[PDB]
Structure formats: C-alpha cells, structure tokens
Amino acid sequence: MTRFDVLTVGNAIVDIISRCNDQFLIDNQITKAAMNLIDAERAELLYSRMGPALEASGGSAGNTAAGVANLGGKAAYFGNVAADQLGDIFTHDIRAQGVHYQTKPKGAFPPTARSMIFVTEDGERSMNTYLGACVELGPEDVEADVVADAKVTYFEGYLWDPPRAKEAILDCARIAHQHGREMSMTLSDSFCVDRYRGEFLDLMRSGKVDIVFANRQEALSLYQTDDFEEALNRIAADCKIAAVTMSENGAVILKGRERYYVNAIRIREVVDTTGAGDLFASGFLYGYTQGRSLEDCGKLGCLAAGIVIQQIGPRPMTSLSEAAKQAGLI
C-alpha cells in the first residue's frame, strides 16, 4: 500500500474575490477569463479599485488536493507560502481538509501570494496574481518520501512562471517514475500554454507527464489551431491519457485511439466558475487512484466541477463524497 493517492504541486495562493461589471475589466486592461500576472505595484493599484472582498484559500493545485481529500482520497501538497497571516490562513485551510502539507516558509518576505479574482455577471472569473513567496519554491521543497509514496503526482503548468519550480517538478518526475508512480499536469491557462508551449509539449513527449488535463482553450492554444478535432487528435498522440474539458459541453477522455465522452451536470445557475478545472481534476484523479474506469473518472470530475461553480470561491464547502454517493459514483 501507499501513503497518498494524489500529491499536487502548485503556487500557494490566497484568493481575494469580488464581483465586477464587464466595463471594470476593460477599464483596467484585465484579460477576461485569464490568469493575469501582476507585480506588487499593480497589485496595490488593482486592490485600490476593487470593491469589498472575500478571502479564501486558493491555488489551482491546492484546490485540487483539497478536492481529492473532500472526496475521501488521501492527498498531499507542495507549495510555498510566507510566514505571515495569509500564509497561516493557507496552511490552516489545506491541513484542516486533511491534506498533508509540510512546505516550510523561508521567512515573511516576499509575502504570501494572492490573486485578485473578479467575477462578472456571467460567472466568469478573471484572476490577477502576485506570486510573492511562490517564487521561492524549488527542489529543496521536494519531500522525496511523499513523491515515492504517492500514486499520482500532479502539477500546474502555472509553475513555469516562477523561476525554480520547474526544477522541483523534474525531481518529482524522476522520483515518481523510479517508484512506478504516475505524473500528471494541467495546462492551467491558454496564455500560460502560449508562454511555455514547447516546454509543455516536451514534458508530454519525453514521458515526464503521463496524464494531461486541458480545457478547450488550452488545447487550442497548445497546437495553435482553431480546429478542436485536430487538437484532440494531437493531444492523444502526445500523452498517454488526456482529459479535456469543454465547460457546459462536458469532457472527453482520450487514451490512444479510445475516446470517452462525459456529459456535464445540469446547473441551477453558474455562480462563479473559479475552481472548475481544479475540481474536475480532483474528481478525475480520485476516480483514477480508486481504480475506476476512465468514463467514471470523467463522471467524478464533472460532478465535482459542477458543484464548485454553484458557489462563491474555489473549494467546495459541501461534502463531495456525499454528493458522489448520492450520484452512485460512491
């Protein structure tokens, strides 16, 4: 037996969430629906223009680990915060969910990462992220025993922005594969894919990544195409398993020549799309590490995604395991 189902690795971030009108995005030159990297000065500027807000632990991979644990799986997380109040919040929330989290802060400065997330009337989220302490994540933060004892190690494409995180990920891939485990990544964001297109392709083609998560936008960006069918064919050729999400249109899981389409759950109303892809990965990787069929992994993904988009904030505040039991996915 193993000690963990899923280890995730990401930018440790606290979210600062507010609703805005569409004009706000245009006036502030915020790219809608994207992750927008910002410096400390821009962070202060945007915050001064933001309305009253709510705070919640975030980080894409963090959300994913929390979601695995909520479902009843065993999760761990690597990510670097600062020794400050935001970091203490971050540490509390993820450990409180029963996720193993032992990455040690290096000091108080730079401070813990935060993302100002603006939710428009259509439920879309536009993130503005100051990386702070996340720039310090490196190979020293790899808990080798944790990687070795985890069935799957999953990481963000977003980790390619800070300088040394990629080296930790390469160490992770080596360890995971030497112990017969699997590696997984999410493409994270279509602009992130654009920044690191060749690098991400090489991760898949060299076999460093076994399982890739993408949405439609990321897949189209990856192969620089308007043709979604081309994108699916190419992604299936480049990685062992691909899980591609398509919002209200559900998901498709690809493995060689196999394709498994999965319907999205019908929604009351889309409240806030923040976390949707993260929780799709929770559900998928929980199913995968429980030995479930690829279709059933996709079902568990879409269930968790559907739940998170019906609340404010990125981590479901209700029981995913209960929801899966009621859905017969157990």
Ligand SMILES: Nc1ncnc2c1ncn2[C@@H]1O[C@H](CO)[C@@H](O)[C@H]1O
């Ligand atoms: N650069 C980033 N790296 C990792 N996660 C991010 C980044 N910017 C925003 N997020 C997280 O994305 C989550 C939504 O997927 C939010 O909870 C937010 O914290």
Ligand SMILES: O=C(O)c1ccc2ccccc2n1
């Ligand atoms: O075809 C492209 O080259 C392409 C496609 C999608 C993109 C999304 C964000 C940034 C750059 C992109 N570039």
